[PDB]
Amino acid sequence: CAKGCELCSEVNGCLKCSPKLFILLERNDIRQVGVCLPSCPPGYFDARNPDMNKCIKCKIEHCEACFSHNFCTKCKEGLYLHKGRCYPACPEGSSAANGTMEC
Amino acid sequence: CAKGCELCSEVNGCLKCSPKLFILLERNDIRQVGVCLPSCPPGYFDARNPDMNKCIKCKIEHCEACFSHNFCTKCKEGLYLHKGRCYPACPEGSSAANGTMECS
Amino acid sequence: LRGCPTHCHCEPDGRMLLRVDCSDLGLSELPSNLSVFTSYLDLSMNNISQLLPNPLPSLRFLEELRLAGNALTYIPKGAFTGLYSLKVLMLQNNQLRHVPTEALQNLRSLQSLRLDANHISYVPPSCFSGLHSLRHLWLDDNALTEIPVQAFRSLSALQAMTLALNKIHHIPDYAFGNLSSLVVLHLHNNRIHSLGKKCFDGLHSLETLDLNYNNLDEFPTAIRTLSNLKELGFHSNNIRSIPEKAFVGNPSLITIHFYDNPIQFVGRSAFQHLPELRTLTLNGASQITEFPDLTGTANLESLTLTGAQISSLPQTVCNQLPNLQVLDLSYNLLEDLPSFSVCQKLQKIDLRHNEIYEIKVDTFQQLLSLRSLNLAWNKIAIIHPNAFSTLPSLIKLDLSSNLLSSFPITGLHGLTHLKLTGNHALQSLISSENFPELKVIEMPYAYQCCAFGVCERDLEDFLLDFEEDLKALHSVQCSP
Amino acid sequence: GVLLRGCPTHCHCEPDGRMLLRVDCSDLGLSELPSNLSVFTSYLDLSMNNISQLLPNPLPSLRFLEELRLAGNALTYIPKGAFTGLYSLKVLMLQNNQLRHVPTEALQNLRSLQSLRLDANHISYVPPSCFSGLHSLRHLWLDDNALTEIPVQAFRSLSALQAMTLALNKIHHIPDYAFGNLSSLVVLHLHNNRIHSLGKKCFDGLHSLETLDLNYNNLDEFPTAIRTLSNLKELGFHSNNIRSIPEKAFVGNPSLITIHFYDNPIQFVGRSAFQHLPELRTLTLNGASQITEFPDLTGTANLESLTLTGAQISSLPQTVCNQLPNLQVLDLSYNLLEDLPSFSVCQKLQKIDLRHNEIYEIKVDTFQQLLSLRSLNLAWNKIAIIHPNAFSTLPSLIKLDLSSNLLSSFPITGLHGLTHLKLTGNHALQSLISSENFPELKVIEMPYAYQCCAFGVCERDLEDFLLDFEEDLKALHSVQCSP
Numbered sequence A: 001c002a003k004g005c006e007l008c009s010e011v012n013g014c015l016k017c018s019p020k021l022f023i024l025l026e027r028n029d030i031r032q033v034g035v036c037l038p039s040c041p042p043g044y045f046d047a048r049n050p051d052m053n054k055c056i057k058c059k060i061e062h063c064e065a066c067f068s069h070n071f072c073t074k075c076k077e078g079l080y081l082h083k084g085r086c087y088p089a090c091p092e093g094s095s096a097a098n099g100t101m102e103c
Numbered sequence B: 001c002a003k004g005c006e007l008c009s010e011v012n013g014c015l016k017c018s019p020k021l022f023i024l025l026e027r028n029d030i031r032q033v034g035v036c037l038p039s040c041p042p043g044y045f046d047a048r049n050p051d052m053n054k055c056i057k058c059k060i061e062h063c064e065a066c067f068s069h070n071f072c073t074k075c076k077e078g079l080y081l082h083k084g085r086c087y088p089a090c091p092e093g094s095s096a097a098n099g100t101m102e103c104s
Numbered sequence C: 001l002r003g004c005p006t007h008c009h010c011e012p013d014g015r016m017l018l019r020v021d022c023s024d025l026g027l028s029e030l031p032s033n034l035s036v037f038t039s040y041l042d043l044s045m046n047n048i049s050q051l052l053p054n055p056l057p058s059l060r061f062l063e064e065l066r067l068a069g070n071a072l073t074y075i076p077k078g079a080f081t082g083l084y085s086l087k088v089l090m091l092q093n094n095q096l097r098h099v100p101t102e103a104l105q106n107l108r109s110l111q112s113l114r115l116d117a118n119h120i121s122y123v124p125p126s127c128f129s130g131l132h133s134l135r136h137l138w139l140d141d142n143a144l145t146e147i148p149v150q151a152f153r154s155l156s157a158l159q160a161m162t163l164a165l166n167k168i169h170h171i172p173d174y175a176f177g178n179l180s181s182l183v184v185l186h187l188h189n190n191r192i193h194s195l196g197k198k199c200f201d202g203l204h205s206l207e208t209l210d211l212n213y214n215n216l217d218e219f220p221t222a223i224r225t226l227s228n229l230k231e232l233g234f235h236s237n238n239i240r241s242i243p244e245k246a247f248v249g250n251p252s253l254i255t256i257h258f259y260d261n262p263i264q265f266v267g268r269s270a271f272q273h274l275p276e277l278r279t280l281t282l283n284g285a286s287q288i289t290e291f292p293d294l295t296g297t298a299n300l301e302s303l304t305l306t307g308a309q310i311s312s313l314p315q316t317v318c319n320q321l322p323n324l325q326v327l328d329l330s331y332n333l334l335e336d337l338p339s340f341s342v343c344q345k346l347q348k349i350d351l352r353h354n355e356i357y358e359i360k361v362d363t364f365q366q367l368l369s370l371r372s373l374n375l376a377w378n379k380i381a382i383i384h385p386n387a388f389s390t391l392p393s394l395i396k397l398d399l400s401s402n403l404l405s406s407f408p409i410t411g412l413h414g415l416t417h418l419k420l421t422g423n424h425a426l427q428s429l430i431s432s433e434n435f436p437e438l439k440v441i442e443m444p445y446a447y448q449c450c451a452f453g454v455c456e457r458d459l460e461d462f463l464l465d466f467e468e469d470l471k472a473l474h475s476v477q478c479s480p
Numbered sequence D: 001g002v003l004l005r006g007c008p009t010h011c012h013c014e015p016d017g018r019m020l021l022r023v024d025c026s027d028l029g030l031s032e033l034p035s036n037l038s039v040f041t042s043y044l045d046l047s048m049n050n051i052s053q054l055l056p057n058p059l060p061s062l063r064f065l066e067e068l069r070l071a072g073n074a075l076t077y078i079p080k081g082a083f084t085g086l087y088s089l090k091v092l093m094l095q096n097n098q099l100r101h102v103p104t105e106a107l108q109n110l111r112s113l114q115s116l117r118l119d120a121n122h123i124s125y126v127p128p129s130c131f132s133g134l135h136s137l138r139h140l141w142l143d144d145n146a147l148t149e150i151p152v153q154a155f156r157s158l159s160a161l162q163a164m165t166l167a168l169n170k171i172h173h174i175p176d177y178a179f180g181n182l183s184s185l186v187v188l189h190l191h192n193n194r195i196h197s198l199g200k201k202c203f204d205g206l207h208s209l210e211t212l213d214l215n216y217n218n219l220d221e222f223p224t225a226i227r228t229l230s231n232l233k234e235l236g237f238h239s240n241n242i243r244s245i246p247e248k249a250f251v252g253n254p255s256l257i258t259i260h261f262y263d264n265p266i267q268f269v270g271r272s273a274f275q276h277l278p279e280l281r282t283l284t285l286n287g288a289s290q291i292t293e294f295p296d297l298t299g300t301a302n303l304e305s306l307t308l309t310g311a312q313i314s315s316l317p318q319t320v321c322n323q324l325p326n327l328q329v330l331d332l333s334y335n336l337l338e339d340l341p342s343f344s345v346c347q348k349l350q351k352i353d354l355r356h357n358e359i360y361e362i363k364v365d366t367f368q369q370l371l372s373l374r375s376l377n378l379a380w381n382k383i384a385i386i387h388p389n390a391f392s393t394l395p396s397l398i399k400l401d402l403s404s405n406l407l408s409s410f411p412i413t414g415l416h417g418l419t420h421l422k423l424t425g426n427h428a429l430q431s432l433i434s435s436e437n438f439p440e441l442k443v444i445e446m447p448y449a450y451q452c453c454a455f456g457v458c459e460r461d462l463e464d465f466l467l468d469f470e471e472d473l474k475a476l477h478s479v480q481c482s483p
């Protein structure tokens, strides 16, 4: 069928992944395609569930990589990261900021 | 709007009749037109209501005119009338027909 | 044509018998001269203040007289004397304030009498005296206050009567005593609040009773004596409950209407022994805690009973219910479910908003006629894998708002509607395959809908060339 | 080697920053990891790769290694000196291995480690002081494991943690001060566990916690320990066995924005239970039968969506709408409502659903000045009479449902040109309704068919695909009418 895959269709690709893998759904030309990965690509975050493990896009403003939703793991350059979120200026400061951009 | 009518539309005809008259809707075109009558034409029967008086088609087998639904007033010829409905043969007792065709 | 009055329109009945139409001609008085052999005379909408100081009897062949909309305030005693063949008299839409005290007497051949749409409030006793052929009587849209028990005592040949749209508030015992031949009685749109216990004891041949649009506070128990009753209507009242053994006296009932009544409770045996009854609907009877007994009424095709507190169904519920097509026990408190297998011929089932926690194996087995199954808004944690294995005709399935995580897919292939929203733990993907012919889908998550494909010039050439394919891709719905 | 080493055989390398190398050796089915491995490596991916034992031949001196991935391997353990030379290690990935315990000493003193993934293993034991010397650790994954109890001892050193997942385990109890020292913790995931009992001071540790996930668990009572989380913003305890929300439940947690408690057998909710949550936007309460009174919402006026169904609410306060500005959708269906308040003060209202109530009449002011209202459902009530001007001031009204309400007549003032009109079940409604003073009607339900007969029954590229789909729905739709 495919790498780390158990159930596939020619149209939609992989429909069910191996036990501990994550499924990634991305839209190719009016059609949805599923890939099986050991961990999710940049922009996505890994979410495990008793039925389906899925790669989930993290819609957080100015966030490059995230732990879940509402919490960013790595913020974009030129933007400070404080408690899993991204601001132009850090409210408390003090703990912000060294040479790095991580309050 | 029209004769014996108070609220009408050019497209649909009469929509509301004078207080005690009956509305007749057909429905033979594929289009509905409303006429206002003092009483319903043959095949229909008069039903009065506090809001709208309407002529109602009498869907009873072999019935020419009726008092309401389920009760026929005059049956088709060659068919006997018994207790508001019509049979070729009368159900029980008399059920006997005279010179007339009305199972007593 | 002499014989036919001027401005009027005549037409032959039986050969050399005349039907005369002199309706909306705005006559001040009825036609002059006019010919014998007239068997039909229509004078309607015609400003006739008084039928005449010079009436025209000698029309002994007159079969039908119409006198509607003529604004008559009274009818003289000798008005219809010569009319020996009169079968039907029409006197509607006039300003009569009382039934003619003597004018209608001894019309031996009179069969149907229309006195509706008047102002009549008083019905003088022995005004219908000598009417032996009278079968049909209209007295609706009038100002009656009380059942004219005395006047009605002579009409033992009546078959159909309407006293609707009046102001009758009370029906005494034996109000229609001598009316043994009466078949159809209309009392709808009145002010009937109280009726005696023996108020309907008279009519033995009554088949339809209309008490609709009235002001009843209690179930009319007087009904109990009408053995031949077939159709019963008492909807749009203020009745609060149907008592035990309510229709005990009325088998061979076919239709019963009691909607728009604030009904809270219904006796268990209330609907027993009605073998001709085909449909039973009971909406919002909150005080019902038990499923009703239907012994001797196995001819039900549609049973709906909602908004109650039914905790459980007897194991052998379907033993009482062959021929049943539609079952709707939505909005109840059901936890366990019976077999339902004995309930063949079942086409539709609706069990939404109940407390159902589990669907066993046999609970839906061998329902080959079943088409729609709604189990939405329950607490169904687990379904047996083979629960739907034997449902060939199943096309619509609703399992919305449940506690499902997985799904038994064996059988069930190619249904038309599938609804699975509210099942938050249902996250796995569902293929377009093992599910063709699907046209309507509800899904807990959008990415599952996407699996079913719902996610200058020469672009128009693209649209036109690939038309049927595109419309074939838009022939599927999916709400996330 | 020792400086000039190539790309490992069968592997795929690619330049990162100048003079830094990314080495991808994933899905090559290695028995052992690459031998002659190079410095300048800043990214090493060995995934889905049959590594029974990480090495007898260690590879430190990769002091520029930023990221190590070791997923999908067959590792049962991690030797103590495994990650010694890795001074620049920021992220370590060890998921989908057969680890039965967190490495007793192997993970110690990785100074720069920020994110650690030990999920999808078999770990059941977390030895104390296994996380000792991790000063940069911000993110910890420990889900899909066989944990039985919160390693309170092991967690006592991670005072810099910000995000933790202990989901998909077998945790049944949360002791007092279980996460005591985790003061910097912001996000805690405990969903999909077997948590039945939790202490009263079990969450007293984390002062900076903002989201708590207790979903898919086995709680019988509302977790009162919640009261100590002042900075909490998102709360999840849905799919449990909680029977009621007590009075003053979220008293300790203002600035709450989202709360999830669905799939809980909730029958009763305290009146003041949802007081003082000004940042809350949505309140949904379905099937709480034991509720007899409308809930008080003092200090929480930013509700945009209020739905409360299947209860026994007999009446609404006169000044109910005083508490609900900004409200958009209101749904009090399946209750026992007879009289209705003004609802005029509740502007910005877009949708209203009051079906299956015992409403007998619609007054004048009960729907006045609702200029944003679009959908009004009053089906299955007992509304005998409607004031003529009841709907006079609803310009944006397009959907109206009056099904099964024992109506005889109808108010036609205003209301012109709506989209949906439903009047079935009103048996006394027999008069005719014109196509005029009613254009734009597309969906109609009618008590009688002859009333239906009165309505004529018997630049961008490839977005044109989308325009075709929009245009497909409308215009292919003719006027509908079901009797």
Ligand SMILES: *[C@@H]1O[C@H](CO)[C@@H](O[C@@H]2O[C@H](CO)[C@@H](O[C@@H]3O[C@H](CO)[C@@H](O)[C@H](O)[C@@H]3O)[C@H](O)[C@H]2NC(C)=O)[C@H](O)[C@H]1NC(C)=O
Binding pocket: D029, D030, D031, D050, D051, D052, D074
């Ligand atoms: C995936 O990993 C497993 C374990 O690391 C690999 O299993 C190993 O397979 C080899 C041969 O296929 C076995 O070799 C044997 O060695 C013994 C000496 O111990 C020798 O006497 C035998 O004749 C045989 O050659 C090895 O024992 C076995 N490992 C274990 C722990 O059983 C497997 O091959 C890997 N799969 C792939 C596709 O690389």
Ligand SMILES: *[C@@H]1O[C@H](CO)[C@@H](O[C@@H]2O[C@H](CO)[C@@H](O)[C@H](O)[C@H]2NC(C)=O)[C@H](O)[C@H]1NC(C)=O
Binding pocket: C026, C047, C048, C049
């Ligand atoms: C219809 O008949 C009535 C009598 O039933 C006529 O009534 C007359 O009305 C005028 C005023 O319009 C009075 O001055 C007369 O005294 C009335 N006469 C009688 C005998 O009542 C009425 O004029 C007639 N109308 C038409 C259009 O024919």
Ligand SMILES: *[C@@H]1O[C@H](CO)[C@@H](O[C@@H]2O[C@H](CO)[C@@H](O)[C@H](O)[C@H]2NC(C)=O)[C@H](O)[C@H]1NC(C)=O
Binding pocket: C153, C154, C156, C178, C180
């Ligand atoms: C009650 O109805 C019965 C008929 O069922 C009447 O009996 C007939 O009355 C007429 C009087 O007009 C007699 O000529 C008949 O001989 C009676 N018997 C028949 C027709 O079999 C009875 O009179 C009615 N009672 C009252 C008080 O009106």
Ligand SMILES: *[C@@H]1O[C@H](CO)[C@@H](O[C@@H]2O[C@H](CO)[C@@H](O)[C@H](O)[C@H]2NC(C)=O)[C@H](O)[C@H]1NC(C)=O
Binding pocket: D156, D157, D158, D159, D181
């Ligand atoms: C409990 O939390 C405190 C406060 O963050 C931690 O205190 C630090 O302890 C380490 C020793 O492991 C010192 O090197 C730091 O200087 C301390 N920081 C302070 C005092 O601000 C402590 O490590 C945590 N764990 C315990 C006490 O077991």
Ligand SMILES: *[C@@H]1O[C@H](CO)[C@@H](O)[C@H](O)[C@H]1NC(C)=O
Binding pocket: D001, D035, D036
């Ligand atoms: C690594 O390189 C050295 C040369 O410096 C060589 O002797 C050794 O065999 C190589 N090992 C492998 C596994 O390629």
